[PDB]
Amino acid sequence: PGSIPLIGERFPEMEVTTDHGVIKLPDHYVSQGKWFVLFSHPADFTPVSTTEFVSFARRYEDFQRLGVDLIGLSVDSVCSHIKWKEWIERHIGVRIPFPIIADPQGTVARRLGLLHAESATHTVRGVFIVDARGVIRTMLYYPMELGRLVDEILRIVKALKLGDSLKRAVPADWPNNEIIGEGLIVPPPTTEDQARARMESGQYRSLDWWFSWDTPASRDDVEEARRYLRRAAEKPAKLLYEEA
Amino acid sequence: PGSIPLIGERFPEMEVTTDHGVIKLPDHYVSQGKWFVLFSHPADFTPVSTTEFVSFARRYEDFQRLGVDLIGLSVDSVCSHIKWKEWIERHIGVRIPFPIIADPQGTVARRLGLLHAESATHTVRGVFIVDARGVIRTMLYYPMELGRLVDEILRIVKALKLGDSLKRAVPADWPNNEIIGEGLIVPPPTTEDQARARMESGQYRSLDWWFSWDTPASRDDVEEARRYLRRAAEKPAKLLYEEA
Amino acid sequence: PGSIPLIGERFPEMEVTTDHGVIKLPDHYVSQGKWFVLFSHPADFTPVSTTEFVSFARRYEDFQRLGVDLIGLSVDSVCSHIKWKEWIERHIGVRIPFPIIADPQGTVARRLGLLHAESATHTVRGVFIVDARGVIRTMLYYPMELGRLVDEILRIVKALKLGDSLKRAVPADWPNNEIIGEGLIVPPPTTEDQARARMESGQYRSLDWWFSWDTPASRDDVEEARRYLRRAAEKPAKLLYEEA
Amino acid sequence: PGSIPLIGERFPEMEVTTDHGVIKLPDHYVSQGKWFVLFSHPADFTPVSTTEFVSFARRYEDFQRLGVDLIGLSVDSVCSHIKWKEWIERHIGVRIPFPIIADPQGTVARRLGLLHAESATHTVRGVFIVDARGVIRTMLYYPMELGRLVDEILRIVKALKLGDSLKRAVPADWPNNEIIGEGLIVPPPTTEDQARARMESGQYRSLDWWFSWDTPASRDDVEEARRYLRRAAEKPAKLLYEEA
Amino acid sequence: PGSIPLIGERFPEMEVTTDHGVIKLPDHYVSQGKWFVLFSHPADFTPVSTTEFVSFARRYEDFQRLGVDLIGLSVDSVCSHIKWKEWIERHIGVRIPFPIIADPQGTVARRLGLLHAESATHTVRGVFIVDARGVIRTMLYYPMELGRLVDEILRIVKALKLGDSLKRAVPADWPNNEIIGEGLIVPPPTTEDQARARMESGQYRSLDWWFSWDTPASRDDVEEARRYLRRAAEKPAKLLYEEA
Amino acid sequence: PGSIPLIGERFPEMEVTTDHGVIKLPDHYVSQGKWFVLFSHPADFTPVSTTEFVSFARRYEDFQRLGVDLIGLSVDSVCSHIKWKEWIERHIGVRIPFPIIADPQGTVARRLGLLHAESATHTVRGVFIVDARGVIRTMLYYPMELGRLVDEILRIVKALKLGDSLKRAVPADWPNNEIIGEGLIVPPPTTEDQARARMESGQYRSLDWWFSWDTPASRDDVEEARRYLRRAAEKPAKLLYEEA
Amino acid sequence: PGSIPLIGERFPEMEVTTDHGVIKLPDHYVSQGKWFVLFSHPADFTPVSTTEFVSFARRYEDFQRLGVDLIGLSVDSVCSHIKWKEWIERHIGVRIPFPIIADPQGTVARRLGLLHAESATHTVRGVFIVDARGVIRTMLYYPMELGRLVDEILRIVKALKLGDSLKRAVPADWPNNEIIGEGLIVPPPTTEDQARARMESGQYRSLDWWFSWDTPASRDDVEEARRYLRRAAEKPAKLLYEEA
Amino acid sequence: PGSIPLIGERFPEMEVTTDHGVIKLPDHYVSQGKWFVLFSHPADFTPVSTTEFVSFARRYEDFQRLGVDLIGLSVDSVCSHIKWKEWIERHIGVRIPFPIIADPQGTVARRLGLLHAESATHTVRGVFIVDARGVIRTMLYYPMELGRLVDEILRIVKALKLGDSLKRAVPADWPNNEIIGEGLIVPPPTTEDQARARMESGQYRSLDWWFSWDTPASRDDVEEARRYLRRAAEKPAKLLYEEA
């Protein structure tokens, strides 16, 4: 096994070198009132990693609408990062606008547990979702051989921010949940007195005293979440390889 | 501040008590030639967890068809697991067919790093995808306040089985990748000789010696994967709360 | 092979989550000048445990009259505790009025030595009798297979309270001791001069200088304690399973 | 705190010196197919301890009916044990037929955790109920100031032995339980398949799939157990101090 | 082997429970300007031990007249001590007026090295002679099978007090030394100059510069010591077993 | 602050250099079926030590009659021992026939715990009484300022040999015990069955079941032990200083 | 400070990943009878490193002619190495024919002491000259800001090989030493007999018994070495930036 | 198996005994605004070491022009150093003007990592180039059997001082680099913003945004550096051996 930071912990304090300059994490993003998604890839000039950078870049505006910044990470150095970006700009027609951390001695990698048994030398496809307080909200470890579904990363941040802003929990497969649809869950009672007050209140649709929900998300909130999933499910209109 | 098992490692040898009896992991599933998805939830008779069990139960046939079994985990005991499943079948009309681990002392939870800072006593929403050799392939850690997207778990398992059988890596957002669509990536050359040989075979479409791909997945495999994402993107025709 | 708290020790300082909320032990009871009985059971929705909650519930007023509060404990979570009590009130027609601690990681169980070799993950049927100063006075460890005698727990608390106020030791089987009946024992002399002086005073009935007693308990005190034992001896007029 | 052996563990292998000679525990009883109750008292020529020794002696034949032997324990030496026994025979008219362990260095006391904070030098009123396989079944810790209810010790050994022979769990306050009276509880199902097979059997009375029971105890078993409690509840005919 | 306090060290600071109450050693005696003889015996109601208690009691005035208190010690408890003294008073006609320490966990015994290989559980027949400054002057260890010669304990104390007050060393077998009779020895010179001065000054009988003596002990001092040995040598006119 | 060998332990294996040659303790005496008395003195050419060597020398014959050998010990060298013995024969007229260990680095002294607080460099007046099996039977520690009573060392070996051969314990002050005179004590019963059998057998004089004795020592054994004490008590006929 | 391997030691046993594949050092070269120069550079697509790779590639045949292989090293990955080589081939017209180690976790850099205080993450410009036995012969540490003089690296391996072949030491600045020109030094005598015999044999030119030399190097070996230094001294007629 | 101080670190503080007296390193040279080259040699009166001292002595002027002092090091004592220098002056006609450290117990050698496997006892041919701030700028380790090229030591210090004053990196083989001749390299951009600003400024000749250079070294700086290399490549005019 290996060590990791945990959901509910402050992202560990660290200075990192990127292709945009030196930055402190998580302070650089807190100070801007921004969430960030830190994600890792094994090495520059690798194909699955290249497809993921293009996916993130296509979705950069959707992340900006949510007040979310993107930052990559591999063990390759800054000049390799910049050459790889230039190659993607020239050959695929896509500009990567977000920084990439250079982590040559694996210092960041070992701190975030991004070195798995699949490779002693190269990080797996780690994803840290960090809110504007610098708190880790969600962690995903995908392997070398499988690209990420970047639309699920938008769904996660949109639903987490909706949860925070309405004091609600978010049901499976939201906003297309099979029980309550675009409904959001009221945090259950934690005492018998709260359980009673809730059974007697009639304020919410309920299946039991522990399962109440309402529909407090705006139609804009619901449809933007659904658009991410519709894009994931859509056959692309024109493949970028064709005009390359 | 927590330890996890790692991608590429054997799922740790353990005996667990489920509401179906005592089993050895990963042996029980390895012996049947099955993959398994082990996932955790904080406690029984909690609403997000209930929406997730209903989502998994709706997808159970989709998992079975792939040669994949499901096993749950919370810190609650077997009698609570059985009462909760009875509750779901009676009040929602859905039978949960797969076992749930009872982990009251958190033995399993500490082994798998499922106790994060969000709760000292209750597991987060962890997901271990384990192949038929008993090897961990992917790990996801969703928080208390956010339900999983279960269709992404199906897409991960399908893309992994495809990549394993076709000897390919899977691009971002497969089968709807913006660069190569349903194409799968040839693992890149590891030497200058292999790179020269690959580029002077023209056996594959390529953007560079390190980015080659073909389209070896069948119509059926591709459409199966697209079915998962289309179900994720679509609002269900009727909601299960109406039927209660 | 396990540690325990000891008679004469302060009940250890701890914050516990109950189905009534968060409390500090023993402070929450010391602050009210109340004794408490903390008792454990293996799991919610187990039958012997259900019989014991119903027995405690029937005796709640008897405990209340001595200024003794009740608090249960199992490794199950709050929501399982509230659902279990709801099942008891619905199916047996008895409301459980006292809190149950939820101890999902066995933190409290390990602190009080409630995990024995009968089960690695579930608490035996422990009983801690703690006075208004927060001091452990008596400890009982019943196994999984055997319900407690709750009337003996009343008789212990009543006899302890009498012993403390009257400055007496309590004979075997009080208030029906075969030697001295409802007599209480004068703490024996600790010196030769004290022994000679106790014998020369002839203030008490004696069998020897180390064995003096008197009858200072009131008729109401003795009758209260004899009531507990008569209820334990007599078959209930009507069984609750009947009107179910 | 302090250390103790636990319910479900084999009584610790040990040679003890008693006023009947040296015996190995638990082998000396195992080898005769006998249960034993080992109990402790702080010191010889103490008044509460004397009342308890007389209680146990009066109930000697009730213990032998159950195939249970008695063995005592204090930090006093053999010659003190024999002088104390002679004093009880001479002044109270009661022969103590069962051995007492001499534990001068507290070697046995420390092994069984009989030294609590009430006294660094004298054992509290410990009770270890040990079955004919040498397994600890129940442990009670009464303090210096409070004599035991010896009839509850008979009720425990009778109920444990009945549970063992009829493969049943014993409800609270048996044989006077307020829900099922003299009924004994069928150990609950541990799987969903068994829970369903049980509720389709209609083989037993049931409040739910986890709360089944029947009435397999002999009327002799029931009335003997009730008789221990009726004796506990009975004002004695003639106090033994009268005739001294 | 095993650890001890040594001649010339302060008797270890300790609080001991006696049948006369709690006292602090050596303070209780130092604060009175009294020597004490602490002596041990294996167990109360043993026959050599009884003969030794009677021998000390007969010599109690001789000890008191020298400004020496007696205190005993066994692993037996206070009540046992007092019952044993009652037995000696009633059956031998001798009152034991001095205190006995109760040492049930062997705490004092381990401190004073009174547990030898002859018994793991009961002290041998240790004797600690302690002066009015709390300083250990002499230590004797007699075994279980052999009663002490109490007159030699009187001789040791009288000779040590004479040596201290007259600034002399005491010859072998004093006051019946075969070379110098009742003579006492001048501590020898420690320098060549002191040797020359002494071997010139002619103030003392000498066998050499290192062997000088005088006779500074009063006739009553000498006769007091002779009387201890004369009592040792003479068969008592009447044996206490006869007049019982 | 010192470690000692214990009664009941084998005398520690060691090779010592004496003024008679190198010997192995205890084996040199065990080989011959001899007891030995090892005694120490602070240094050669000290006056108390000289009186003690002369007292041992005069009693050599009494030691040889009991099959006891004598062996001395100081931190002085073999040359000093020979010069010292030659001085005693010339100036006092007494041959020292027994060997003295030379212990220059205090190797033997530290092993036997003979370095006490009185002197960090010179041995106190230790006595080890060792039987023909090489077992330590009694230990005495006299200080620098006080010579031994050698007749008590004879009485100890005599009483011990008599106790061993007759299977008896020896009362206080034997053969002049004030309760039973020259009587020897039968080891007390260790069980109730032995107590009752012994008492009703009438075989011995008794004061109680734990205090039995007879008179199995020959008149010669008794009068020899008494002569030691008579000699200890007698004013010597003529002093050796006068004819010196 | 930091740790290094040393001249005269075996190059540490290690498997390394290069852009030509996986090789074992030093075995891969030892098994071919080849020397190797392992050199490091901080990162790919850095300008000093690029000039050094071009210098090495220009001298590749000079190295091959001596039986010396070249192997580079940086913490950049294999794909980055190959893209950097392509760049050099495309923009400078120079093919890099030798392998580059990929050392992303700095496993090799730490083993060889290539991380200095100038950078925590990137190796300085290290040079290990390793002979055909696998033995380290010479180590150079150039910093980030200063490219190496590759002709001195040729002079070192040429001179070491001559010295090994001819059993000679090589004077400062060989083959242009100011004292002995192209002379090689005879290893000095290690004894006075050798010193006398060396001087008397008149076999060598000599300044003293410890300073003898001859001229055993072929004209071709000398001119090869002089050609390395003349190349180092002469400005190229055409600069490669002008043919880009 | 050796430790070294590193490039970028301050030369370690040490007091060293030389043949010019005690000096403190590096403060002695830092004080004067002087760089120093500290070099080592195995032992005095060894032939390769002699050729090296002569090569340094004859280049002393070139070192003085650069504000560089020289200091030697061997394990030989100060008297040997002075005798050795006298021998070089007398027999070769060359005065050694710089000090030599005496390092008899290898204190300095061990601190600078100058003891390698080639000799446990004698130092290899180490070179520490230390700047006027007392920082280590370059480290060379030549072996016993190979003399240094002292002109490369001048070239290093000349190139380092030039890089420092013009803020430039020095290409391979400067001033005869095969790509840019006497061109000096601008440190590469560390961000994409800097890369773009530099490429659209057109201020520098470039091969790419990471490879910019200009020619800001004076004709004198370039020709002085090139003279070092011309000297190294020139067959000496007359060998000093003939004059000796």
JSON list of C-alpha atoms in Angstrom, two decimals, chain C residues 59 149 151-152 155 175-176 182 219-220 222-236, chain D residues 149 176 226 229-235:
[
{"chain": "C", "resi": 59, "resn": "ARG", "atom": "CA", "xyz": [-38.03, -0.46, 35.15]},
{"chain": "C", "resi": 149, "resn": "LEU", "atom": "CA", "xyz": [-31.58, -9.90, 35.41]},
{"chain": "C", "resi": 151, "resn": "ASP", "atom": "CA", "xyz": [-33.93, -6.39, 39.04]},
{"chain": "C", "resi": 152, "resn": "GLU", "atom": "CA", "xyz": [-30.41, -7.34, 40.38]},
{"chain": "C", "resi": 155, "resn": "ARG", "atom": "CA", "xyz": [-30.88, -4.11, 43.93]},
{"chain": "C", "resi": 175, "resn": "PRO", "atom": "CA", "xyz": [-32.31, -7.50, 52.17]},
{"chain": "C", "resi": 176, "resn": "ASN", "atom": "CA", "xyz": [-32.94, -11.29, 52.76]},
{"chain": "C", "resi": 182, "resn": "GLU", "atom": "CA", "xyz": [-32.15, -6.70, 56.47]},
{"chain": "C", "resi": 219, "resn": "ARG", "atom": "CA", "xyz": [-39.09, 0.18, 56.20]},
{"chain": "C", "resi": 220, "resn": "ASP", "atom": "CA", "xyz": [-39.53, 2.00, 52.80]},
{"chain": "C", "resi": 222, "resn": "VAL", "atom": "CA", "xyz": [-36.15, -2.43, 52.65]},
{"chain": "C", "resi": 223, "resn": "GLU", "atom": "CA", "xyz": [-39.63, -2.74, 51.00]},
{"chain": "C", "resi": 224, "resn": "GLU", "atom": "CA", "xyz": [-38.33, -1.00, 47.77]},
{"chain": "C", "resi": 225, "resn": "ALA", "atom": "CA", "xyz": [-35.44, -3.56, 47.48]},
{"chain": "C", "resi": 226, "resn": "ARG", "atom": "CA", "xyz": [-37.70, -6.56, 48.33]},
{"chain": "C", "resi": 227, "resn": "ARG", "atom": "CA", "xyz": [-40.12, -5.34, 45.56]},
{"chain": "C", "resi": 228, "resn": "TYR", "atom": "CA", "xyz": [-37.33, -5.75, 42.89]},
{"chain": "C", "resi": 229, "resn": "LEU", "atom": "CA", "xyz": [-36.74, -9.38, 43.96]},
{"chain": "C", "resi": 230, "resn": "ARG", "atom": "CA", "xyz": [-40.50, -10.28, 44.20]},
{"chain": "C", "resi": 231, "resn": "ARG", "atom": "CA", "xyz": [-40.95, -8.95, 40.58]},
{"chain": "C", "resi": 232, "resn": "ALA", "atom": "CA", "xyz": [-37.92, -11.10, 39.49]},
{"chain": "C", "resi": 233, "resn": "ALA", "atom": "CA", "xyz": [-39.46, -14.18, 41.26]},
{"chain": "C", "resi": 234, "resn": "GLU", "atom": "CA", "xyz": [-43.12, -13.74, 40.01]},
{"chain": "C", "resi": 235, "resn": "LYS", "atom": "CA", "xyz": [-44.29, -14.81, 36.47]},
{"chain": "C", "resi": 236, "resn": "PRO", "atom": "CA", "xyz": [-45.72, -11.70, 34.67]},
{"chain": "D", "resi": 149, "resn": "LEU", "atom": "CA", "xyz": [-26.92, -12.31, 45.14]},
{"chain": "D", "resi": 176, "resn": "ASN", "atom": "CA", "xyz": [-40.12, -14.68, 33.99]},
{"chain": "D", "resi": 226, "resn": "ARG", "atom": "CA", "xyz": [-37.85, -19.66, 39.34]},
{"chain": "D", "resi": 229, "resn": "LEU", "atom": "CA", "xyz": [-35.39, -16.25, 42.49]},
{"chain": "D", "resi": 230, "resn": "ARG", "atom": "CA", "xyz": [-38.28, -17.03, 44.93]},
{"chain": "D", "resi": 231, "resn": "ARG", "atom": "CA", "xyz": [-35.57, -17.88, 47.55]},
{"chain": "D", "resi": 232, "resn": "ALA", "atom": "CA", "xyz": [-33.79, -14.55, 46.75]},
{"chain": "D", "resi": 233, "resn": "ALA", "atom": "CA", "xyz": [-37.15, -12.71, 47.22]},
{"chain": "D", "resi": 234, "resn": "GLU", "atom": "CA", "xyz": [-38.19, -14.65, 50.46]},
{"chain": "D", "resi": 235, "resn": "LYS", "atom": "CA", "xyz": [-37.72, -13.04, 53.92]}
]
